Design a protein around this ligand. Structure first.
Ligand SMILES: O=P(O)(O)OP(=O)(O)OCc1ccncc1
Ligand code: F3S
Length: 309
């Protein structure tokens, strides 16, 4: 069995920053450090940080006075932020710069009382945080997940309309949603393409190349990782068996029995050590040397705040 590794895979700049923010905070101030939501959607990362004294909460009312609070990479609403800001808490923001970018555009539109549509998945913390930047009741903020959602949306003023997206969506599906927005709302304004980040785009392109060669694709990532789920789905839509797995123990032998070529990738929140262990397990199951595919070079790094060096 041949083992192929997707490229790029694994950690993006936002995840590496966000985890570093929590680690550094722990080093500097000691336990406990409170974190609003899982810092990234990865069980191994989260369990590790919890073992070191990070306490993960959903609501700010769970955090005691005087405490250090870190917002997760996914971002937070203005309401959450103001709810923290009014309290005695020392806040560090691990929100990925590429999510903040979208937040600022929503805020701009709200200031103008002009309606905005976000493309994204209901209930995801990034969607809650981005929708949560809009507060002007004279305008409006609408969530759409599909062309069908576009087809039934009505707005108050379609002459003054803009759209934004979640950073981790399917590039292909999002393109269909945008085509629908533009047919329904010909004057809608957006970015040139979408707000899908470089890392999401690149991993999706990489898993497409992988799935062209591999019969089976393993995506290292947790169940609640949006971007990780998109990688698995992409592979599945190409007719390959694909599994989203937290670690090597999750691999079932039937999945790779008599498979001549297995591919491995990792979502943006999955540490490389998890991939190494997955490879080690595939080798126990008869795989040879892991072969990295040729891939687009990524070179972006986001630094921690100077307050946390
Ligand atoms: O893919 P997810 O949105 O569920 O988050 P994740 O798996 O934690 O990846 C990091 C991240 C954070 C912020 N925006 C994009 C990606
Ligand atoms: S939005 Fe940021 S957290 Fe990673 S997946 Fe994209 S660089």
């Amino acid at each position: 069995m041949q083992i192929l590794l997707a490229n790029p895979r694994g950690f993006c700049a936002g995840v590496d920053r966000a985890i570093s923010i929590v680690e550094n905070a722990l080093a500097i101030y000691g336990a406990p450090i409170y974190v609003r939501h899982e810092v990234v959607h990865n069980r191994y990362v989260v369990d590790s940080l919890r073992e070191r004294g990070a306490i993960f909460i959903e609501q700010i009312s769970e955090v005691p006075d005087g405490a250090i609070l870190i917002f997760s990479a996914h971002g937070v609403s203005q309401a959450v932020r103001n709810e923290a800001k009014s309290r005695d808490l020392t806040v560090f923001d691990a929100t990925c710069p590429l999510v903040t970018k979208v937040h600022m555009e929503v805020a701009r539109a709200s200031r103008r009382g002009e309606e905005s549509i976000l493309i994204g998945h209901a209930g995801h913390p990034e969607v809650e945080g981005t929708m949560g930047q809009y507060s002007n009741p004279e305008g409006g903020m609408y969530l759409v997940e599909s062309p069908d959602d576009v087809w039934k949306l009505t707005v108050k003023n379609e002459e003054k309309l803009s759209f934004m997206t979640q950073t981790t969506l399917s590039v292909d599906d999002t393109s269909d949603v945008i085509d629908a927005l533009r047919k329904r709302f010909p004057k809608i304004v957006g970015p040139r393409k979408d707000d899908i980040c470089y890392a999401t785009t690149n991993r999706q392109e990489a898993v497409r190349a992988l799935a062209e060669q591999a019969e089976v694709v393993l995506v290292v990532g947790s169940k609640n990782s949006s971007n990780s789920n998109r990688l698995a789905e992409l592979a599945q839509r190409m007719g390959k068996r694909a599994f989203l797995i937290d670690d090597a123990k999750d691999i079932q032998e039937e999945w790779v029995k008599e498979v001549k070529c297995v591919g491995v990738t990792a979502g943006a929140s999955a540490p490389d050590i998890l991939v190494q262990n997955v490879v080690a397990r595939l080798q126990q199951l008869g795989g040879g040397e892991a072969i990295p595919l040729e891939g687009r070079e990524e070179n972006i790094v986001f630094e921690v705040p100077k307050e946390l060096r």
